[PDB]
Every structure is written in C-alpha cells, then in structure tokens.
C-alpha cells in the first residue's frame, strides 16, 4: 500500500467534485425553465 503522501497537491481539487470541472454552476444551470 503506497498512500503515505503521493503528492497532496494533485490530490485535493483535480478530483472534479462540486461539479466544478471547467467553470459552470448556478445561472447557466437555471435558465432551462425560463421559456422551455
């Protein structure tokens, strides 16, 4: 088992959580019921 540290930088945000892969949240995700 090699999980001591293995760099924490690459292991903390790149996970792609909070649906934050590129940059789309709120607003862009709330305009479908504006007239459709």
UniProtKB/Swiss-Prot annotation:
The chain holds residues 66 to 101 of 101 of the full protein. This is Apolipoprotein C-II. Residues 1-9 are annotated as: Lipid binding. It comes from the Eukaryota. Residues 13-36 are annotated as: Lipoprotein lipase cofactor.
């Amino acid at each position: 088992a090699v999980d001591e540290k293995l760099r924490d930088l690459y292991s903390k945000s790149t996970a792609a959580m909070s649906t934050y892969t590129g940059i789309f949240t709120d607003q862009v995700l709330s305009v479908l019921k504006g007239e459709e």
